[PDB]
């Protein structure tokens, strides 16, 4: 038993809710919150910008030190950093960004990072301002992640559509 509330059970291991991930992180304080990162860990907009703002820019400060030491991530890759005031850890995962011209096939590799954590609060990867089909992202999530994932979807009308179209 965990502390996530009002999530709709989609599969054995995948749950979904229409909610602001920042709020959900603030309320649950999960072991792991997933950030929709880019390879530079430049948290400007979307999930990344919203989480970083909620940390008072501490996420960005930590991230800049990470990049200065290690260089950029790979598309499809991830790193574990602090969750600051939102979670114990933040798993920064780089889904392919369609609007930047990156290969959507890399979405499965991105979701594989979730399997290294038993439970996660996460966004649907590559959706929103990343430019991919969210119905597609949810399908890849369900077909790739085997650990317990609680998906917070910001957009109400997208949420209604993801549930109604889920196979
Ligand atoms: O306070 C605030 C205001 O800014 C926010 C923006 C988002 C957001 O852009 N979400 C979408 C997005 C964007 C880029 C990449 C992604 O994988 C996703 C998932 C998708 C969604 O879940 O709808 C979410 C929360 C907040 N919170």
XYZ file of C-alpha atoms and ligand atoms in Angstrom:
194
model
C 0.000 0.000 0.000
C 1.218 3.538 -0.911
C -0.159 7.099 -0.489
C -1.197 8.021 -4.063
C -4.914 9.014 -4.094
C -7.584 8.933 -6.834
C -5.466 7.303 -9.512
C -7.383 5.215 -12.050
C -5.927 1.686 -12.367
C -5.028 1.175 -16.054
C -3.021 -2.070 -15.796
C -1.418 -4.251 -13.123
C 1.281 -1.599 -12.589
C 0.185 1.670 -14.299
C -2.139 4.243 -12.718
C -3.280 7.642 -14.056
C -4.803 10.908 -12.759
C -5.612 14.423 -14.053
C -3.375 16.485 -11.759
C -0.465 18.934 -11.572
C 2.675 16.788 -11.002
C 4.184 19.611 -8.867
C 1.157 19.476 -6.536
C 1.173 15.682 -6.476
C 4.867 15.731 -5.560
C 4.273 18.333 -2.829
C 1.437 16.266 -1.282
C 2.857 12.690 -1.613
C 6.611 13.356 -1.319
C 7.250 10.204 -3.380
C 10.561 8.387 -3.334
C 10.972 9.268 -7.041
C 9.464 12.028 -9.171
C 10.295 11.850 -12.888
C 11.261 15.025 -14.719
C 10.690 15.442 -18.457
C 14.261 16.619 -18.984
C 16.399 17.580 -21.959
C 20.006 16.464 -22.423
C 21.341 19.763 -21.006
C 19.093 19.636 -17.931
C 17.938 23.132 -18.870
C 14.576 23.241 -17.027
C 12.737 25.985 -18.888
C 9.162 24.890 -19.571
C 6.611 22.119 -19.190
C 7.092 19.604 -16.374
C 10.787 20.550 -16.058
C 10.135 24.290 -15.746
C 7.235 23.752 -13.333
C 9.171 21.390 -11.041
C 12.264 23.592 -11.125
C 10.212 26.690 -10.190
C 8.706 24.739 -7.305
C 12.270 24.077 -6.017
C 13.076 27.814 -6.094
C 15.658 27.049 -8.874
C 17.621 24.621 -6.668
C 16.973 21.877 -9.233
C 18.622 24.028 -11.926
C 21.624 24.859 -9.701
C 22.197 21.175 -8.956
C 21.684 20.288 -12.622
C 24.238 22.836 -13.855
C 26.853 21.316 -11.543
C 25.914 17.827 -12.832
C 26.387 18.882 -16.476
C 29.637 20.726 -15.733
C 31.039 17.478 -14.296
C 29.466 14.835 -16.547
C 28.420 16.476 -19.818
C 25.004 16.086 -21.415
C 22.712 13.118 -21.119
C 21.742 10.950 -24.095
C 18.288 11.131 -25.636
C 16.632 8.086 -24.068
C 18.889 8.371 -20.998
C 18.490 9.545 -17.422
C 20.223 10.556 -14.227
C 19.177 10.496 -10.569
C 19.506 13.780 -8.704
C 17.910 15.246 -5.581
C 14.143 15.618 -5.335
C 14.629 18.800 -3.261
C 11.350 19.753 -1.541
C 9.262 17.605 -3.923
C 10.518 14.001 -3.505
C 13.465 12.056 -2.166
C 14.940 11.742 -5.679
C 14.268 13.192 -9.106
C 14.823 10.869 -12.051
C 15.583 13.191 -14.984
C 14.547 11.254 -18.106
C 15.124 12.506 -21.667
C 12.314 11.400 -23.945
C 12.764 12.193 -27.653
C 11.571 15.747 -28.479
C 9.674 15.536 -31.792
C 9.705 19.341 -32.260
C 13.560 19.241 -32.146
C 13.582 16.480 -34.808
C 14.533 13.518 -32.531
C 13.668 9.849 -33.256
C 10.364 8.797 -31.585
C 11.695 5.172 -31.474
C 13.845 6.365 -28.535
C 10.704 6.692 -26.397
C 10.852 3.023 -25.346
C 14.480 3.425 -24.225
C 13.454 6.484 -22.202
C 10.699 4.559 -20.386
C 13.103 1.673 -19.628
C 14.798 3.985 -17.103
C 11.658 3.744 -14.955
C 12.312 0.009 -14.391
C 15.246 0.863 -12.120
C 12.782 2.233 -9.497
C 10.065 0.295 -7.704
C 7.549 3.174 -7.574
C 7.492 6.518 -9.428
C 5.353 9.624 -9.871
C 5.835 10.529 -13.489
C 4.647 12.390 -16.590
C 3.880 10.728 -19.939
C 7.199 11.063 -21.805
C 7.609 12.956 -25.108
C 4.062 14.462 -24.835
C 3.062 18.133 -24.384
C 5.701 20.523 -25.807
C 7.898 17.487 -26.737
C 5.527 16.990 -29.701
C 4.665 13.263 -29.747
C 1.232 11.633 -29.653
C 0.293 11.189 -25.958
C -1.920 8.179 -26.776
C 1.254 6.684 -28.216
C 3.330 7.634 -25.178
C 0.830 6.002 -22.798
C 0.892 2.826 -24.914
C 4.702 2.687 -24.835
C 4.631 3.330 -21.072
C 2.232 0.443 -20.414
C 4.163 -1.876 -22.725
C 7.620 -0.992 -21.302
C 7.421 -0.088 -17.613
C 7.095 -3.057 -15.261
C 7.479 -1.155 -11.974
C 4.646 0.810 -10.380
C 4.065 4.118 -12.130
C 1.615 6.852 -11.122
C 1.087 9.114 -14.139
C -0.006 12.711 -13.464
C -1.520 14.368 -16.582
C -1.789 18.183 -16.389
C -4.300 18.805 -19.197
C -7.907 17.892 -18.259
C -9.136 17.387 -21.803
C -6.096 15.254 -22.682
C -6.710 13.108 -19.578
C -10.346 12.446 -20.550
C -9.144 11.388 -24.007
C -6.327 9.137 -22.747
C -8.754 7.203 -20.530
C -11.484 6.936 -23.148
C -9.078 5.699 -25.857
C -7.016 3.292 -23.721
C -6.978 -0.297 -24.924
O 2.357 24.577 -12.379
C 2.450 24.020 -13.424
C 2.406 24.700 -14.784
O 3.249 24.185 -15.789
C 3.065 22.766 -15.924
C 3.243 22.196 -17.167
C 3.098 20.835 -17.292
C 3.255 20.256 -18.679
O 3.694 20.909 -19.567
N 2.796 18.902 -18.864
C 2.859 18.331 -20.176
C 4.301 18.142 -20.679
C 5.218 19.070 -21.181
C 6.461 18.633 -21.585
C 6.773 17.287 -21.487
C 5.865 16.356 -20.994
O 6.235 15.012 -20.924
C 4.602 16.786 -20.582
C 3.385 16.032 -20.003
C 2.231 16.955 -20.284
C 1.058 16.843 -19.311
O 1.170 16.187 -18.244
O -0.032 17.418 -19.586
C 2.742 20.057 -16.185
C 2.573 20.641 -14.938
C 2.728 22.014 -14.822
N 2.587 22.629 -13.536
